[PDB]
Symmetry: D2
Subunit: 116 residues, 4 copies
Amino acid sequence: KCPLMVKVLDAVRGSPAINVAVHVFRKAADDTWEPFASGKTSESGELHGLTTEEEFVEGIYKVEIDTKSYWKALGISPFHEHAEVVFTANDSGPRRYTIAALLSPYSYSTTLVVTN
Amino acid sequence: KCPLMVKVLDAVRGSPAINVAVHVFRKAADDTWEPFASGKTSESGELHGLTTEEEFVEGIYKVEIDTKSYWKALGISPFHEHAEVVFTANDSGPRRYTIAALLSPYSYSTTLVVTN
Amino acid sequence: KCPLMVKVLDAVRGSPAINVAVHVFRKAADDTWEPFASGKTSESGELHGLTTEEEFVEGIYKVEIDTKSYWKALGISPFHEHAEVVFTANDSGPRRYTIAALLSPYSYSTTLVVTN
Amino acid sequence: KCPLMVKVLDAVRGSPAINVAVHVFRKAADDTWEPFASGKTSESGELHGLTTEEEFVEGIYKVEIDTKSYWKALGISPFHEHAEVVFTANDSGPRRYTIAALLSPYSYSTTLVVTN
């Protein structure tokens, strides 16, 4: 069961955000963002299978959601370049992480949900 | 498959809101709020089985989430009395409705998500 | 200086919500909602002068924002009937209350801000 | 009158977020983030005077709010590293930009408001 999931909703259409590009980065020891995983949300607005328990280690992660491209595929030209969530992953045993995002053209909300 | 679901998240603890009381009301012809359904969110913060396709007809509905009692069961004394969402149900074919709520002691966000 | 203010923003247009109708109600001893004050937001999305320090006493208050009518004056037909915030006013000395609201067609966020 | 303002609110305490560090970056032609301006929010949670009309030119900007340090000065150890808003500034005549942020330990909301 994946330890990292992303769900994206659309506040303008009141539906899941489908086929949104999501890029995950990890901060390396050289303090540079290194591509870690990426994918596209499904018809339910959810993106599963980003990583595995073995690959997802403690560190600083950045979740970048390409909101601008998604809005333009629906006919909207927004003003944000992307939604971004930066969080620290910690070990306690074992912790799953879900990033929930709510998108509007000029506003976004993100929540970090931690379940077992 | 239920046509009305409610999911509640906790922005302070970064987890689903468990055992939150949810009351659903429908506006009758006499313009009074009539109890329609109610329940409590599960360990996943979701409340399923509120109604059925046959009982859930067009109308004005009110979803009241008892945030104040939930915060006090966790040790928090908030300032909102409850989170409330009032929406119109419409027929097009057949439409499922999900109310998503994000709770803080002095703030809440609600989203109406419509899936097929 | 008014003890109760309401500010409303538009997440779709990225601007203040102008000329939004706001109705404030107070719960009387008979447990009925009694009209207390109302007004319309200015070009800055703010509504000042709802009440006075002498009229604004402890109690349960409901702030109803007529989102549906505002969206339809801009060309949008939303799905929420209105945004509603219910809170308890308390005395400590003297406390000003500001209700901040962020509106989307299928989502809204409200925050209760308390300043001195 | 400054063309760029940042206001930050606290959803846990229901108050303005005071003395939050804010860093603004601009994307240069070499596609690197170059420090542009920074400051700290006042008792009202607002940060004025970040830049001037002459210095604030079209481009890609990043507004980084140091949420983690602010929470720890109040006794809270959060999970986000910072709130970040990336937007494009455009010329039309003349446009002021306000970034509004609502902070919780495990959630944040940001809105881009454009006034004249």
